[PDB]
Point group: D2
Chain length 268, copies 4
Amino acid sequence: TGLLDGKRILVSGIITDSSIAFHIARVAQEQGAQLVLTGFDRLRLIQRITDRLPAKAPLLELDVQNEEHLASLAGRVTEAIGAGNKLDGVVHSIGFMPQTGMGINPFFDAPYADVSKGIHISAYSYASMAKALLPIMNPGGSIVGMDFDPSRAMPAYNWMTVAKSALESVNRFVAREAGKYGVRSNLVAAGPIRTLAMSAIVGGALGEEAGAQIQLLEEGWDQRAPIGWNMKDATPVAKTVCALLSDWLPATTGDIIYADGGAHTQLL
Amino acid sequence: TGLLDGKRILVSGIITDSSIAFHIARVAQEQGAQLVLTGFDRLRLIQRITDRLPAKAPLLELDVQNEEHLASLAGRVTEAIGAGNKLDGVVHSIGFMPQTGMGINPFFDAPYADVSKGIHISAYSYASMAKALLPIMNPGGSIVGMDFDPSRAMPAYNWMTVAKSALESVNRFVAREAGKYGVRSNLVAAGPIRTLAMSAIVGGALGEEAGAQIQLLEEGWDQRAPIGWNMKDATPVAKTVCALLSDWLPATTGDIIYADGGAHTQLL
Amino acid sequence: TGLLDGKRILVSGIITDSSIAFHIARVAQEQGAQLVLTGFDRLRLIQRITDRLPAKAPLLELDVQNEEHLASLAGRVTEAIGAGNKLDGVVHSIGFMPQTGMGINPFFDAPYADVSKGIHISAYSYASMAKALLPIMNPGGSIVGMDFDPSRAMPAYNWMTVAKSALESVNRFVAREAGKYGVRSNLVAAGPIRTLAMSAIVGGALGEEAGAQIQLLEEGWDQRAPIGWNMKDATPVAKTVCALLSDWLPATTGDIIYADGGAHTQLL
Amino acid sequence: TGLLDGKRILVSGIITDSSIAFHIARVAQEQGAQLVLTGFDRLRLIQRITDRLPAKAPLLELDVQNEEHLASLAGRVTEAIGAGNKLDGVVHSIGFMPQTGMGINPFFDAPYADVSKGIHISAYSYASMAKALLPIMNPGGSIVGMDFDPSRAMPAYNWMTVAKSALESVNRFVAREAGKYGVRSNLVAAGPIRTLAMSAIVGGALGEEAGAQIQLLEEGWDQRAPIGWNMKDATPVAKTVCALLSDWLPATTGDIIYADGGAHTQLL
Ligand SMILES: NC(=O)c1ccc[n+]([C@@H]2O[C@H](COP(=O)([O-])OP(=O)(O)OC[C@H]3O[C@@H](n4cnc5c(N)ncnc54)[C@H](O)[C@@H]3O)[C@@H](O)[C@H]2O)c1
Ligand SMILES: NC(=O)c1ccc[n+]([C@@H]2O[C@H](COP(=O)([O-])OP(=O)(O)OC[C@H]3O[C@@H](n4cnc5c(N)ncnc54)[C@H](O)[C@@H]3O)[C@@H](O)[C@H]2O)c1
Ligand SMILES: NC(=O)c1ccc[n+]([C@@H]2O[C@H](COP(=O)([O-])OP(=O)(O)OC[C@H]3O[C@@H](n4cnc5c(N)ncnc54)[C@H](O)[C@@H]3O)[C@@H](O)[C@H]2O)c1
Ligand SMILES: NC(=O)c1ccc[n+]([C@@H]2O[C@H](COP(=O)([O-])OP(=O)(O)OC[C@H]3O[C@@H](n4cnc5c(N)ncnc54)[C@H](O)[C@@H]3O)[C@@H](O)[C@H]2O)c1
Ligand SMILES: Oc1cc(CC2CCCCC2)ccc1Oc1ccc(Cl)cc1Cl
Ligand SMILES: Oc1cc(CC2CCCCC2)ccc1Oc1ccc(Cl)cc1Cl
Ligand SMILES: Oc1cc(CC2CCCCC2)ccc1Oc1ccc(Cl)cc1Cl
Ligand SMILES: Oc1cc(CC2CCCCC2)ccc1Oc1ccc(Cl)cc1Cl
């Protein structure tokens, strides 16, 4: 077995054990992948979490806003996996939007400096990670990023929706570059998952008419999904990412795969 | 290994060894599935083909327009796999449209009797196969059908485009029914594959301004696809179907997966 | 004034004064169009209704399933508008699906004979009306049909959803034919309107878990729509149809215009 | 007559007489609107152009990156139209992306500082113009912006595609805000028009494999469009904008109208 046997895969975005990236890494290891991880601010905090993965993995620092971190990334990764070895997979599982761009802050009140930052981290860095890492990927490789369907507007998500729309567009252009390396680029559009990131905005709208809206949005998902949706279980999305990292979707690129219980295909 | 180890899967639509269903069956067997096959008119012709699959499989007759064939299908399948065993997978890989509905026949000149027949076989039968077989599927099961992206109009495809639009809609409703059984329903939208079905219409427009259009359509696909597209190689699509039949896309239903080299994501 | 001054427009689909076609005709007359109407079974019933339009209009019989009615249509229309005059506009505002294909009947229990009939009337007849009438339309003309967004599945709508998916596809192919005449073809996807057609299925699910679902669907529309939605007011949709019949959307064809309060652009 | 009789409409984005905004203003005046215009850097250059409009209009300076220009805009507009008068329409017809984000510059080589600037001007400013001007719009009003379908990737357009994807998302959120004022927000997705903006990138890829790609893209548009497409004629798009500014699409918001000859609805 091992869906990902022999594959070398870089996984960004682990912060806690609820992190989507955490379960992607876990399942990938269960499936025989050898991992390199990146983490952002609290590397020692991140290391404690990554120590509970089924296997050891080098953990490197990557602030996606940091051009020195980006400039050095490929060298550092090759140091980690061994000269003459290349990556077969890359997982981008990172996002951020300042508080003004989400939750209860009026949409019109977000200053562009804040929006711009969120777009830098959530959308542009998909291209910047691909730039850094494509020169060290094997033909038949796979880059995957995380998306939340922004094709319709909704409460609370606000400027992050705009950043995910940008990301979808970025992914299509990354695919054009990656194809030259024989590499695929896709997003997985996940349904809601109880993660540190959304506890943030769920917590940010406690007394408020955005918290109630978010609750309604969540309940509608499991209702719409023909197979249901369990926000407490990240593994169906981790498995989907691993599917795209495997050799089993070899003809799919510039694309989006919906791991959302089928909710997006149903009006109600 | 065996992506589909232990799974029992019914595969319809084999007619020659170029058949998409043929390569789906082949790869599924290579991955440890145990198959039941159905074939339509020339069962002895179909048997010769299915004898070159890596393993033996019961082959049953199914004319999807035949209510007796449909009424008896589940009993016949259970006879084939053994009382107390159920299906984990179903592949619908069938289509037909009379000559008036495609190629060089003017779009307006197709009589509804012909269109209706093509829709019966290409779209409605997805629901009729699901009706027959869901009562004999295991939770966690997967129904897959074959699609050709009908979201834009194009030369030659004509009324089959309409039938695939109907199919996409049917699939979303099948997913609502299948979810009750814990079963997924999805389509794979494939790029063009050199199959008996399209040699038919490719052959039908030899001297004509539909044959040239078809040639242009085919060349544009490999051009648009960031990873290219090889119309002579059905296995990337077979692998995609097997991915959906596996446990690795467990959160995806009522949906369409594009196995088209990423062509649909690129304008040019 | 007169948005449609001097234009000759055929309007099908009037049955009562709640009919979408009724308000399309009314607004068109208010805007200076000269109309020809078609009606289906109860022509004397239809005549009583059409007598309350602001102006007189010839009313002709057209059963869209009747090849003699279709074969004779263009001659009959030209008789009505005068030799040497041609149509500038055509409104298709017709649909039907037998009771088995909607409401509370299980999706799987609709026989294809019933589905086929609904598709004939709701989707195929768009092409058959275009075939009949394009040879009598002026360059710069406009064909419009009525749609209900079938891009997602939903309760109760069932097989009519499939028929509207087919229609969307038909419209794209009609546009290819109409372009040769300098004629546009588009659909207007309306939000729900209290019409005879949906009182039918609203009435059909009185005690039932499809009636409640329909109520929920309706309430969500006005909730989702940024400008709200009033199911009791057909005129915003009539005005939209007239916009497409006018010279003010001259570059739009094979397309769908959403007159739905913007509901389709919002998740909630 | 006068489709826009009595309406007060602000039109941004005039730079030359080939400007889409120029023809929008012109047609709007021909239809009885009273205009206020805004212009960006070369106000005296812009004034020469705007002097050839059918009627006089106040012209104000607006650099959409300038928070003082934005903060003062509504006061300045009301000064221009008269205390106690409000706007019925707003046209956003502005975009910019630095040279690194388009044409022949590799996609990966655009620094975020450049991308961020283009997104600020092309996408974010749609929200910032709505913020400024909604407090001075009448119920039943209309905000329109200009889009180029970014749903698929393509040569040369590069990071502007990403900025238009963001814009589409912004528009859906603007619609949620505007609905509170009884105001509609929509985009018009135009086919290619020979304008100063694209002569820029057409000129930027003279000897190069992006210039040839752009030529191919342009030729395919008129080929795909069932009614053809004339890149030299901006008026079909101006008329479409005026349609959305009128009372004739009263139920359409958060939406995109395609004024592209129907090219987007056809594969080829
Ligand atoms: N949780 C959900 O319901 C959900 C649904 C769909 C998509 N997503 C997406 O999944 C991805 C992962 O988020 P999550 O929900 O697992 O939340 P999370 O908090 O677990 O992960 C977000 C990660 O982004 C990282 N990050 C922030 N700024 C960074 C930067 N400057 N450089 C490098 N890393 C940075 C954080 O350190 C964190 O590890 C995000 O793109 C999110 O938008 C989440
Ligand atoms: N080949 C392509 O380029 C391509 C691309 C996308 C999608 N598809 C779809 O893939 C599917 C398989 O087609 P293929 O290209 O492998 O061609 P094929 O000729 O190999 O397969 C078509 C099958 O449909 C069966 N069939 C016809 N009428 C039937 C009926 N009454 N009952 C039961 N079976 C019936 C035929 O017997 C044949 O086995 C079709 O749905 C087709 O529309 C094909
Ligand atoms: N009412 C809504 O909420 C709504 C929403 C979106 C789209 N639509 C669509 O609008 C169109 C008009 O329907 P309506 O809601 O105004 O209902 P309606 O009952 O007023 O109109 C339906 C019309 O179809 C005609 N018809 C049925 N079979 C025919 C045939 N054999 N030949 C010719 N005409 C035939 C009927 O005579 C009737 O005039 C339909 O296509 C419907 O699907 C309705
Ligand atoms: N021309 C086309 O083929 C085409 C197709 C689809 C969409 N569009 C869109 O139409 C809109 C108008 O562009 P055009 O093609 O008429 O080109 P144009 O050069 O005529 O117009 C662009 C305008 O944007 C203005 N602008 C730039 N930065 C600004 C800022 N800081 N503040 C205020 N204004 C600023 C310029 O002054 C200019 O007036 C753009 O959004 C463009 O993306 C153009
Ligand atoms: O992209 C996401 C999407 C969701 C689902 C969701 C459904 C409830 C309406 C709101 C959002 C949850 C979390 C998401 O990630 C982030 C969100 C904010 C920041 Cl700051 C960082 C990250 Cl990583
Ligand atoms: O659905 C299909 C799609 C294609 C690809 C293609 C691209 C060239 C423009 C035309 C079609 C090829 C074959 C397809 O299957 C059938 C087609 C006709 C009949 Cl009668 C039966 C079947 Cl199964
Ligand atoms: O196409 C339609 C769509 C709707 C809106 C709606 C929203 C409530 C869920 C259900 C449907 C209402 C009426 C519609 O027309 C018809 C419906 C049935 C027949 Cl038999 C004939 C016609 Cl014309
Ligand atoms: O948004 C646009 C779209 C197009 C059509 C087109 C088709 C040929 C492939 C390329 C682009 C032309 C011009 C466009 O406007 C701008 C472009 C650049 C700048 Cl810097 C500013 C503006 Cl306003």
